[PDB]
Design an enzyme around this catalytic site. Structure first.
Site, PDB file in Angstrom:
ATOM      1  N   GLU A   1       0.823  -1.211   0.000  1.00  0.00           N
ATOM      2  CA  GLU A   1       0.000   0.000   0.000  1.00  0.00           C
ATOM      3  C   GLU A   1       0.861   1.266   0.000  1.00  0.00           C
ATOM      4  OE1 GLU A   1      -3.206   0.031   2.662  1.00  0.00           O
ATOM      5  OE2 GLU A   1      -4.043  -1.922   2.054  1.00  0.00           O
TER       6      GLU A   1
ATOM      7  N   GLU B   1      -6.076  -8.026  -0.574  1.00  0.00           N
ATOM      8  CA  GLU B   1      -6.775  -7.848   0.695  1.00  0.00           C
ATOM      9  C   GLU B   1      -8.237  -7.524   0.427  1.00  0.00           C
ATOM     10  OE1 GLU B   1      -5.185  -4.909   3.317  1.00  0.00           O
ATOM     11  OE2 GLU B   1      -3.095  -5.529   3.053  1.00  0.00           O
TER      12      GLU B   1
END
Ligand SMILES: *[C@@H]1O[C@H](CO)[C@@H](O[C@@H]2O[C@H](CO)[C@@H](O)[C@H](O)[C@H]2NC(C)=O)[C@H](O)[C@H]1NC(C)=O
Length: 305
Positions: free
Chosen positions: A133, A240
């Site tokens: 991320e 995710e």
């Protein structure tokens, strides 16, 4: 057989207590529980993403040496996963920062990945995830960091392993075409790039609440990204995703995964967030025997296995 090539879980712990570098094992952080992983393997899951901290793996400078203790605890869990025939995603859970500073050295980042990938080069079941991320950085730097990562990985002779690349803006699927279209300009000798995105179904998409916006928000937030992969001839994995243990969230998840299964020619699979031994009360705990998501979603997710 299956709907997706892969379906599994994140296995959290080694990235916990990130305020304390290096920190203490068993106090600030732990490594995932292999017995608990086998229960999920028994259930049908065949991919596991194991976060860790760059600063605990290679302290001080990212061109430095390995921390032998932390690496050997981490290695032990990776090789259990591949020892049972499942893919293990090596994930430096770092948000594109090192000791808190946004990473800007493509050569120090390429050296980081060479050192790390060199310890997994002949394990065909390891997957490499360039960084967890990226966000609040320049798009150009982010793309160069993903390319530098690919370059160091292959340089070290890890050429049979998939590389999961992540984009800016937390690599969210719903924002992908807003920020990360530049990521098409990534190249790999082995041609084994998979674009890894994340999607949560709560109001902000931050994945911090057990309420979803609606029963259809999950499908809505993956359409654009699905078209982008099909358009540019790329591949993706939802690295995710999670929802709360209520039926609105469950329906959103199902319709999200339905849409991705309908587009499995670009989507190679998905990975729930998160399992691991220190989650306790967590709203998304996939950890057996009692985690809320293990209790509410495992049955649901097996239908896509
Ligand atoms: C790792 O996972 C196993 C299985 O989930 C855990 O073992 C269970 O532990 C509870 C509590 O100590 C026992 O009452 C059960 O009998 C055990 N089950 C099995 C199948 O062995 C183990 O405790 C976990 N390790 C942790 C959480 O540190």
């Amino acid at each position: 057989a299956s709907s997706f090539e892969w379906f599994g879980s994140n296995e959290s712990g080694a990235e916990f207590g990130s305020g304390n570098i290096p920190g203490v094992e068993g106090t600030d952080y732990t490594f995932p529980n292999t017995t608990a992983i086998q229960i999920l393997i028994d259930a049908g899951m065949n991919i596991f993403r194991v976060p860790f901290l760059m600063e605990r793996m290679i302290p001080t400078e990212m061109t430095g040496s390995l921390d032998t203790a932390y690496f050997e605890g981490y290695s032990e869990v990776i090789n259990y996963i591949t020892g049972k025939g499942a893919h293990a995603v090596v994930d430096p859970h770092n948000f594109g920062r090192y000791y808190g500073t946004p990473i800007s050295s493509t050569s120090d980042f390429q050296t980081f990945w060479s050192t790390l990938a060199s310890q997994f080069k002949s394990n065909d079941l390891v997957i490499f995830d360039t960084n967890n991320e990226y966000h609040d950085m320049d798009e150009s730097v982010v793309v160069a960091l993903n390319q530098a990562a690919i370059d160091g990985i292959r340089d070290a002779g890890a050429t049979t392993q998939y590389i999961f690349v992540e984009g800016n803006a937390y690599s969210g699927a719903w924002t992908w075409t807003t920020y990360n279209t530049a990521m098409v300009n990534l190249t790999d000798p082995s041609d084994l790039i998979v674009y890894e995105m994340h999607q949560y179904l709560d109001s902000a998409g931050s994945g911090t609440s057990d309420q979803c916006v609606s029963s259809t928000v999950g499908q809505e937030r993956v359409v654009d990204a699905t078209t982008w992969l099909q358009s540019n001839g790329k591949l993706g994995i939802l690295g995710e995703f999670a929802g709360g243990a209520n039926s609105v969230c469950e329906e959103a998840v199902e319709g999200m995964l339905d849409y991705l299964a309908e587009n499995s020619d670009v989507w190679l699979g998905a990975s729930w967030w998160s399992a691991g031994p220190w989650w306790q009360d967590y709203i998304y705990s996939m950890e057996p025997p009692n985690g809320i998501a293990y209790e509410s979603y495992l049955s649901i997710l097996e239908t896509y296995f």
